[model samples]
Structures are given as C-alpha cells and as structure tokens.
Target chain A: GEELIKEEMPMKVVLEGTVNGHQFKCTGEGEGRPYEGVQTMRIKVIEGGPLPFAFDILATSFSRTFVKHPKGIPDYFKQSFPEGFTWERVMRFEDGGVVTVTQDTSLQDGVLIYNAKVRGVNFPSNGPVMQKKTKGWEPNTEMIYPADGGLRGYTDMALKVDGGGHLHCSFVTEYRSKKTVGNIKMPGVYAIDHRLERIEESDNETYVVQREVAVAKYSN
Target chain B: GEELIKEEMPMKVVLEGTVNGHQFKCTGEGEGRPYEGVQTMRIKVIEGGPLPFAFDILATSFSRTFVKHPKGIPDYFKQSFPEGFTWERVMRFEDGGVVTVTQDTSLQDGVLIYNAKVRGVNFPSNGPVMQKKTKGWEPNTEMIYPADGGLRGYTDMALKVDGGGHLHCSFVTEYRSKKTVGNIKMPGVYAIDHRLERIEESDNETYVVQREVAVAKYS
Candidate 1:
C-alpha cells in the first residue's frame, strides 16, 4: 500500500501517558486562523483507561458580549449575588419560563480564569416556583514562542465542573511541515503531545494521566 | 441568540425509525466529487436503542485492482476453492507471515452484491502452520434520479458479517439548499432519512429497525 502525502497539512497532536499505573492515549487536530489570535482544538481520547471520549474547544484573546443575556443565568445570580442589588424581572412571558447564563473572567499570573454560571426559573400557577442552577470554572493559559520563528507553542487548560470534579490537560507542539491553502504557505504541520489528567480533588489527591500514541493526520 | 449561515454547506442526512417496537435514530453526511461517479457516506447511529455507532463507506461504479494482494486472504481460498486450481506462493517473508484480501462483485437484478474474503498464513518452525480466515459480503444499490434535475436520490446498503448475522440500512435525500465552493455553485444541501435494521437469520427471523431523527447539520 502507498501512503499519500500532502503539501498542506492540519495541525496535529499526539498524546500518551498513564493514569495511576494504567496507560492511555489521545489525539487532537485543529488550526488557528492566520493572524487572527484565535484557535480551535478538536480532541479525542482514543485508547486504554478512558476508552472513548471527545471534545472541541475554541480559545480567543478576547471575550464576546451580548445585549440579551443568555439562558439560565438569572437564578444563579439571585441565589449567589449580594443582597440589595436591583435585579429586574427580565422575562415577560409567564407560561414559558426564563433562563440566564453568565460568564465571569479574570486574568491572574498570565492565566485566564473563567467562571460560568447557569440558572433557570419556571413559573407554574398550580405549583411553587421551580429553579435550577449550576456553577463551574476553568483556567486557560496559551502561549506562542517565537524562538523558532513562532513555530513552537503550548496550551494549558484545566476545568472544574459541578464545583468539585475537574480535568486537567495540556499540550506542546513544535514545527513539523508548512501548511498551504489555495497558493499561500500558511502555518502548517506541528508535532504535538497532549497530556490529560482526571483530577482527584481532595486533601491527598490522586490523578489519572493520558497521552496520545501516534502522529495525527488531518484532511484539508 | 444568533445562528450563523454559510454559502457553502455540507451534505446531511437525518434518520428516524423503530427497531422491533423501540425507536432509534441515526445521522450521516458526505459528498461526491463533481461528476466523478464516486461518493462517500459517513454514518453514525446517534440515539435511542443503539446509542453510539459510526462507520464510513466509499462507493464507486468500478472495482479496484492491485498487483500485490492485501493482507489476510490466502487461507480463505485454500479452504473454499476447488483443489484443481493451483495457487502460487506469493510471499517470501517466513517469520512475518502473509495475508491476502480479495473482493468479488456481481450485478444481480440491478443490485450489486459484494463478497469479501481475507486469509492469513503464519509459518512457525517450532510448531505448525497457523491460519486464520474470514468471509463477508454486502449488497449495495445506489440510484440518482434526474426527475428533479438530479436533486433527489437514495442508496440501500446491506451487509452480513461472520456467517449468519447481517445489518441493513438505506437513505433518501432531497434538495435542502444550494452549496457553493470557490465561487462555484455546486450541488448542495439534501435533507435525508437513513433507515437501519439488524437481522436475525433464524428459521422465523426477527429484526430491529432504526432511523435517524432531526435535521442533520454539517460543518
């Protein structure tokens, strides 16, 4: 059989590691828009320990705002925020409930810490008011190194869901091949290793580590 | 609050059906090269009954040929073929062993039946010759209708693995939206339905049916 080669390639990351003592592997591929300061990562845990799992994440240097607040946000702020704040009734429809979602972010020691909250309220005439809310947070740190002409880079991302449970994963990639779209040579192939962890949050914590085992290939 | 729209869109298929009396769903997406007479289908069983399953298939009008046979093929012919046919030794590596794969296809009543066989032979000097073989087949029927200028179509594909078990699936798509690429308007969006079935090959057979639900969205 023949292995086909391409002039332009996708950014790929291979990960391999161990959780406690059991081994695992993962792979991810994605690319950034040229000079756009935005990047997307599509990752999958493919082998061992964690048998099958996948996720996609987009990271940018800026935050997005909306005039209309997202769904599942109002209830969370009502339950957690300080008393005496003028929180208005944003919903007009009584039959259909309302939801609000909010994101609070901060920069600490070059790391972007993000806190997300969701709340939903349902008004029922026959019964009492029903509310559902959740809170979560994550820390993301991304960097690009120009030492090799901006060909080396890494990202550290860790998230906690439901207040206590969390996962930590990081990746480092170096120059591989040039990527081409149309006729221009863009930032292309990068041999990368993604390290993943299932964090055990306790006094004496234990964790699971995972890594991708093979070179990742992408289709244009 | 806002949904984005694109000029160029991916092909999509949404399937919803019932297996036995239980309901199930599947989704698939793919496209063919312009006027190339070749197509690819990527399908996944996404909900109900069968929770998660996915597969990719390529179909063409013609079969492919190779000078060097693929892995896992020789042992099957030895067990099935007649003794009068003299088969040549095609391998030189004794330690690594050899495998061969073969595909035989036939046109039967407008449907194409494909039979695939794989065989492997391993020479162990300390012990005996170890052989492994498998045979499988599938029937594929694909059609394109020019009734609406080729904007409507369907494909029926069924496959049986091992000796007695089989699965069947079919899909039909209609025009959803026009697709554009490189400043050219290509044959685009087709909302489709994929129906799937699992067979029981007993005397009084029992089977399960599945279908994809919801409009399939592509990226």
Candidate 2:
C-alpha cells in the first residue's frame, strides 16, 4: 500500500503502569506513528517484581519495535499479519534463573496456534537445569456461556485471564495444554489436560487484560 | 446417633470417568453412606495422563470419606463440624516424591477458613531429602459474582496435582501466596496475579471429583 503524501508524527509517552507483562517507564519519540515505524523508545523496568515479570522491559521493546504493537501479547502480531510470524522473549528470574519463551505463531480460523520452545538455566546456570516444550491452540473469542443461554451482561465475559473482553479479542476456546520436563512427559505435569476430555472448563474471571495494543496506519 | 439406624446401605458402585485430577475405576461399598462412618472403596488409576492422576483414586476416596462429602472437597469438613475440625492427606508422586497436606478448618463471616500445612519428600522414600513446614489459608464460597464487582475468580486454582476444585467455592479475593523451591522463598506466584493492581484474589475454579457412592441424610 502506497500513498502520495507522507506525514510523520513525533511521539513521546511517559507513564508509570504496566501494559501486558512489563511494568515500565519509557519515552517514545521517533519518525513514525506510535508503534508503526521506527518510533524509538528507551524503556526502563521500574519493576519486574514477579517470577514471570523478569524480562518485561526488553520484551516490550522488541515486540513494539518489530511487530509494530505497543504490547508484547501474541495476537497483535497475528492481527498485523495474516500468514503469521515468529518472535522471542527472554527473562531473568530472581535467584539467578534465566528463562526464554520463544514461539513460532500462526493464526487461522480465528485460532492462534502457539508452538513454543522453552529453555532455561536455573540457579547455578548448571544443575537445577530447566528445559521444556509446550504448545496450545487458542481461539479468538472471549465469552463465558452460562447454562441459561448466556449470562447476558456477562456474555462474552469470561474467566479473567483468558476471558473474552480481554482475550486479545479471541476464542471461547480449547486448551488441553501440556509440558515436558527433561523429556519425561510429567504426569500431573502442571497446566492443561483436565480429565482427558476433549475440553475442560473453568471460570477464569480474570478482569480481561488487553493483550493487543493499537497502532498508526502504515504505507510505503 | 444410631437410634433411627442407617440399616446398612449395602452399596457397591463401580464405574469410570475422569474428574478433578485422576482417571480410574473404583468400587464403593461397605457401611452406612458410601463415605461416612465405615465405608470402603478400591481405586486404581487408568490414566494419570497429561496431568497428575498419580494420587487420583486414593485421593478421591479419602476426600469423600473423611471430609464427609461426596465430591471430596475440603470446605464440607468445616461445614460438618460447625465447631470446626482438622484432617490430613498424603500422596506419593511417581518418582518417589511424597507429600502430605494437613489442615485445620472453621467458619467465620459466612466463609469457611482452611488453614493447612505441607510436608514433602523430594526424592526417594529411601531419601533424596524430605522436609516440612509450608502453610496456607483457604476460604470457600461458590457464588458467581457480578461483572462490576466482587473479588476475582481464579484464585488458588492451584497446580492441578495439589489443586482441589472440589476447592471451597470462593474468591476474586486477594491472597498472600508464596512458594519455596529448594529452600528459596519465591513470592508472587499464581492466581489473583493479574487484576493484580494490588495483592488480592482467590484460588478458584478448583475441581470437585465425585468419590463416595452417596447415601441417606442423617437426622
């Protein structure tokens, strides 16, 4: 898509809050719109307090810089591309444990299939060795269907974490998740696969986090 | 309290389906109610599958039996004992990891509070290492809250193996959650972690697996 006239917008954002998993403070000033082009931002992690929050700053920066979204969630990448794409995110946990969550993502029929590879180094960067592979399919619809037709006001209102409104605008889905530690498929491993049924259900009631960020229009 | 008598509900139930964390075949029979006073059930795992079916069978039997509930959920223990009570459960993972959960429960402010302790054996019963001293508090309320408000839902939903959905039905409430792996105290764990504006929320949506064969209600 090309345009006869091109206009550049200067951007500067200063905020103290969390967008996606990173709690950061940054200044975004570049030649393009906020998250479309080289809208450069120097991000600082004011806090990566939780075990998972370990790499929010660089993670956020990388996603915004490449996939062209302000947040690090996956759907934005899918929304920005039809054939899908890939990205990597790394984190350093307290006690010296390092983690890298890199994924090759694809979206189709509204389902975002995430085939992710996890690699990690525990305390000594040696012994408590951590490594695993995991994959799951998530549809792009977030709605909590109640027994009586629908919860009306709560229609599309899902269990918070992966619930509708906050589900990156994705599925009322299927998640039989799995994890493999040391190549020994752990029984009762961790998350996913409830009852071996085709699908398992739970009220995530998580308030609906916005996993995708808005961006400016782009053309060459 | 046998004046009216249960007359021995000679029940023997055998069937299979997956619930909570395990998948297996079990037969419940013997005394009064399938789970109450004196009852018996032989449980075997058919599929620990992708999740921990490790202790599913025995776990269900014990929960349904002593906690005195059909679903094997803990809150009922407190319900059955308005004066409050205590109990314990033990399990051994496939690789020789053994753990026990002991609890004390009571009711207050319409919420049943469960205080529990955890002890574990990291390796072989022969001894890779075993340790104790882990504690937690749980409240059970199974009500669906409105969108505008109430606490959060998916609180201590827990890691499937230890997670009991048969969990006391409550939450959207904050939690003081923590975990100690190899003597390292790592706070900021799961559940209620997202709305996470502050440290609040529940350990929900835990499961309730049917165990006892069910029976007559006491007078």
Candidate 3:
C-alpha cells in the first residue's frame, strides 16, 4: 500500500553513566539534549505510556551486548551482525497478529550478501501494516546463547558492513502504527506499538568486548 | 485543519568538538555513536544525498541559537521558549518549496502557550512530504555576525515541561523518517526533504549572549 508512516516520538535523553561488566565496562555521557541529570532511570524519563522508546534503547543498544551467551559464534561475525543470524520467522504478536519475515542471504567470496523483508496483516482492521525491507553486507559472531528464546547465540563486538556500500545502496525499511500492536502484555498498561526490525543497523562502530554467561529472558 | 504533519528527513550525525564563544564556551560531544570519528561531520552519516543531516545540525541547531541577536526579545522568555517567539510562517526550502506554519501564542501568570504547524504540497510532484506541528511554551532572543557561530548563548540548562515528571514524566517529541523526500532544485543532486516544525521546543536552556546577525540565506 501507499500509506505513509510518521514518527513524532517522545524525546530520548542523552545518558551519562557507566555500564560495568566483567568484559568491558565503559563510561557513557550525553550530548546535552536534556537528561544529563534526572537519573532515576537515566533516560526512561517519560510519563504516560508504558515506556517504549527508552526501554528500547536499553534493551537493544545497552543490555543486548551484556546479554548472557552460552555458546559462541566467533568474535568477527558477532560484531559483523549485531542483531542475529539471517534466519527468517513468523512473529505472532499476542494480539493474534502474525507477520512473515523473509530474507535473501548468501556468502560471496570476499563479500557478504544479505537482504530481508517482513509482511503481516493488521488484525481487527487487517490492512497489511507490517512491510519492511533492508539489505546489507554481512562480511562476518561471538557465542551461542543457551538454546532458548529467539537466538541460540550472542556476541559482543563491532560489526561493519560495506555500510551503505552494500547492494549498491538500499533502504532501511520499517513499519509503525497509530496505536498499540498485538496483545503482547506490556510491563503494564497500553499495547506495545513496538518497532520490530530483524536486520537493524547503526552506522556507528560500537567497541565490542566479549564475556559469556544465561538464557534467562526470551526474545519475544 | 487538524491533520497531523509528519517528517521524513535524512538521518543526522552526532558531533565531536569544543564549542567556544564569548557568551559561553562548552565542549560538545557524542555518546560513542559510530560517526564520532567520521569528523568532517558529527551526526547521521548517510550514504547518498549532499549530506543534508550533517549540515542541518549546524544550521538550525548549532547556528540558530548562537547566531548573533540584535534588538531581540527580552530574557526570561528567550530561555523559556527556545525555537522562536511563537509566531508561525511558511518555511521556504532552497529547492523552491514552502510549508505553512501556524501558532497560538499567549502568556499567563508565568505560564506559556504556543503551538504551531507547517504544511506544504511537495515540489515537482506536488504531494505533501514535509509536514510538522507541535505546541510549546516560547518565552523569546537576537542575532549576531562577526561572531563565531555556536554561541551568544549557553543555557546548558534543563527546561523541562512537566516530564509527566523526566522520570516521573515525559514532551520529548522528535520528527523523523525512514527515507528521503521531494524532487526539487538543489546545488547539485537529489531532492531535499526536511522538517518544518513551529513548536520545535528545545528543553535545554542555552545561556544566550548577544552580537549582530542578519537573517541571511532564506529558509
């Protein structure tokens, strides 16, 4: 469809603190947008709303690297593909909503070929809202997490694609809605209008350090 | 009349440098995002496009606040409403496009009331690409030249608006997109897609100083 998605999200505060771990403990600071202070929850400083954005940063960007990984997948590839391996699956939101994730993955000599797409029908109002596609160079991992939840492995490191030099350049596709999505029980109140992307990438080169440990939380 | 205007702009880069000036000098930095080392620019380092995001931060963000102010508005309000005096207008893009901005301005026993909107039919294609709107509490500032951009101000302060309480609360509204916009004229190639918000509230209190800045290079 030709419907357009708009994002006017609540602001995310720049945090200043330290994430201490056995492998790599680093001190982080803010760019001074706002919350360089107000440290009850660093940046989760928003009211009303079950706290999505701030939680998102902590989940994927912060805790992701610190997560427990039992089995390892080589340091290089781990840094290369921070999200996970390119296996596609159907995401069934508790709201009885389902979407199919498909990807084109291959390994070419001296290069990486990867691309993915997701499509789903919005329930109740079923209008195919989930439509996202992205392609990148996975020229790469660190470990295999306890065989449970979403991934079987985890790795902490810096991964670099040809950047946008992959697939002669591509789009970072995503889907968002006006209201909450699925019946996925939230930390409390409201529905989860979460941003679900499989091959998420940031042009930033994060310094990676590895320390293995559990398979506590599920990726759902 | 009550339609929501969205933003579909290029990504911005996070900068790494020391911002110095007479009004106030401060060392601005990033939180270890990738572009921290890509220097020539500090924010979102996009692949194609004349790199609008990098230049944008410098323009409205860094420069707008620092650009010398002549006979500007009073103090208290300036630190209060960051963006402008709450008046609205159509922002013209260099690519020959325009977006409408509307606002409601009023003041109470110390409280502020200001909200604005910008709407435009995209250029060449004649569709709507860059639409922005929001409400804020603008309370007022000036311009300067012969002044090294970045300062005349340093309200490295926090102007929180009920964070519903920053932790106990949250108006951290931001305009963003998943792709580029419009096919209009440019200094070189591709179209120029950008945000046109009137309420554009900056929660950070910039310590504002003064100099002389002409409103050059039309917006």
Candidate 1 docking class: incorrect
**How far in Å is the alpha carbon of A105 misplaced in model 3?**
3.0
lDDT of 3 by residue, B22-136 (tens): 1111222121111111111122212222221112212223111111111212121123222223323333433344434343333333222233332333332331111111121
The DockQ leader among the candidates is: 1
Q: Tens-digit lDDT track for model 3 on A128-218?
A: 2111112211211222232222233222221112222211211121211112222211111111111112222222213211111112111
C-alpha DockQ of every model: 0.02, 0.01, 0.01
DockQ versus reference, model 2:
0.01
- Select the stronger candidate by DockQ from 1 and 3: 1
- Model 1 chain A poorest ten-residue lDDT run: A61-70
Question: How does candidate 3 fare on TM-score?
Answer: 0.19
- All candidates' lDDT scores? 0.27, 0.27, 0.22
- Judge candidate 2 against the unseen true structure and give its global Cα lDDT, from 0 to 1: 0.27
Every model's TM-score: 0.17, 0.19, 0.19
* Native contacts, share recovered per candidate: 0.00, 0.00, 0.00
